[PDB]
Structure 1
């Protein structure tokens, strides 16, 4: 059923992708420095300062997005802005796209490790990365937009 493809993000994709976060919690999870409501301008500013912004496509629809917010040649990349269209969740889009990003870290950056950080409330995120072989390494305190204390779970995975 799912025949996924990927390509670099394009201008025309930004309206779609900016529609993906459904609430303030989802935006915080994937882009904690953004302010609700999300906007194309905020997404474009992330793209401009990051690397590897990639979309996943199925049946002619952009269904997922990700990029790197850290990249260190020969060392590691950190994967962020991971978001999937709400109508397409639970179908393997993030799994697919994380694979693609792992290959790109290996290929382009000669990375031996992928890092991700997932906020504590985001069970789907934590289970996603656990299923894909990431292990938790540390927990950092952060604050949410209401000033409330949250836990940021830093995970990683060897790439090879």
Structure 2
């Protein structure tokens, strides 16, 4: 059914990907420095500051997006901006794209570790990363757009 492929993100993908977050909570989980409503400009700003922006495609549709927000050659990468089209949630897109990013971190950055940080309210993410072999290492305090304290669960996984 799901026949996923991947390639580097392109300008022509921005409007699609900027359509993915469906509410302020979803935007905060995947891009906590963004301001609702999301926009192509905000997405392009991230892409410029980051590395490895990659889309996942199925049946001619861009269904996922991810990048690295930290990269340290021979050391680790940290995954962020993981977004999935609302019509394709729970179909394997995030897990597919995390595997692609793991490979890119190993191959291009010679990373030994991938870091993922997940906000506490994002249960789906915490469970998914757990299923993929990520372990929690620390919890950091952050604040949401209403000034409320949230917990950022910092996880990692050795790259094999």
Q: TM-score w.r.t. structure 1 length?
A: 0.99
Secondary structure at the aligned position of 2:36 is classed as: coil
Aligned residue for 1:50? 50
What do the CA deviations read for 1:91-139 (whole angstroms, capped 9, x no partner)?
Answer: 0000000000000000000000000100000001101100100000000
Pairwise CA RMSD: 0.4
What do the CA deviations read for 1:57-84 (whole angstroms, capped 9, x no partner)?
Answer: 0000000000000000000000000000
Aligned residue for 1:60? 60
Aligned residue for 1:21? 21
Tell me the matched-pair count: 160
Equivalent-residue separation in structure 2 for 1:114 and 1:158 (angstroms): 6
Note the C-alpha offset of 1:46: 0.2
List alignment gaps of at least 5 residues for structure 1.
none
Secondary structure at the aligned position of 1:53 is classed as: strand
Equivalent-residue separation in structure 2 for 1:39 and 1:150 (angstroms): 24
Equivalent-residue separation in structure 2 for 1:89 and 1:131 (angstroms): 16
Runs of 4+ in 1 over 3 A off after TM superposition: none
Equivalent-residue separation in structure 1 for 2:125 and 2:91 (angstroms): 14
